[PDB]
Ligand binder design. Structure first.
Ligand code: HEM
Ligand code: CU
Ligand code: CU
Ligand code: ZN
Ligand code: ZN
Lengths: 155, 155
């Protein structure tokens, strides 16, 4: 089995852009997230599963915020702490960061060892942030991901 | 409890340079390699455990080849195939790639889900290549890592 997650670059004002897919598969050691993305900003990006199966924007402080409809990091165990993908004190949605090369493409797979079966992740959203991920809530909350750059619904 | 691996940039002609350490720790999901490196060439770099506890150069067909004293990828199960860290068909030494930022720093930890205890990696070497790693032997052997850029002995 695999899940093919369609991913859009988010722009609530001018309209989202299709940027490819991320394929989720089961390895013998956890779920593998294999990007097949194009036309994204180069850099190493925070990459997390968020709670709600939505990539819609939401209003906050008289501004429409991209991706905010996805809610927070997926946290079924209620750690209320952002962390490493191999830490049991981290949100279940915390994945290794996603690398976009200088040409805007992302093709480097990453493992989430705590996630074992595809059924676990259905009904949630897959988010790529503008910033990175130091896998801590310090010095910036949620790894320093910041704005939500691209998103797809996992189902 | 950790192994602190001292790492040098390899240059047989001009002399090696000290570039920091990589710390190895146990997690509940395998060994974690946490780099604390500086002044390396930027890029996504192949990162593997090699067979021999040496970072010395070795002459091959009349050329002194940096790091060749380390031997090949550590392959105790004899897969004879370079692959993903989460595949049982891959060399045991196959790690996720090492990110070196433009400022020369490497600080992004990676997981080896098939390695469980610190003792298993002692007596080997930790290699960082000039090239990348597509975790295949095609289109280039050994993921396209090419030359050996930096190394430390795991003790
Ligand atoms: C770990 C994170 C990063 C890695 C591994 C990385 C690596 C690279 C590599 C390998 C290249 C192409 C080789 C070269 O021409 O030098 C490159 C190009 C470049 N990178 Fe990065 N980079 C990272 C993050 C960033 C960030 C955050 C920025 C700035 C937003 C940036 C800006 C650039 C620019 C301007 C180029 C030149 C490509 C061009 O001429 O259009 N990089 N980077
Ligand atoms: Cu996120
Ligand atoms: Cu190697
Ligand atoms: Zn998180
Ligand atoms: Zn290998």
């Amino acid at each position: 089995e695999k899940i093919v997650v369609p991913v859009q670059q988010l722009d609530p004002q001018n309209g989202n852009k299709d940027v490819g897919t991320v394929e989720i598969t089961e390895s013998a050691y956890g779920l593998v997230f294999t990007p097949k993305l194009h036309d994204l900003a180069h850099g190493l990006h925070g990459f997390h599963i968020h709670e709600k199966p939505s990539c819609e924007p939401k209003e906050k402080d008289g501004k429409l915020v991209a991706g905010l409809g996805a809610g927070g990091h997926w946290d079924p165990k209620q750690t209320q702490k952002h962390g490493y993908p191999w830490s049991d004190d981290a949100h279940m949605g915390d994945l290794p960061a996603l690398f976009v090369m200088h040409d805007g493409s992302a093709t480097t797979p990453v493992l989430a060892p705590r996630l074992k079966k595809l059924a676990e992740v259905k009904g949630h959203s897959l988010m790529i942030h503008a910033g990175g991920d130091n896998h801590s809530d310090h010095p910036a909350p949620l790894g320093g991901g910041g704005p939500r750059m691209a998103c797809g619904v996992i189902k």
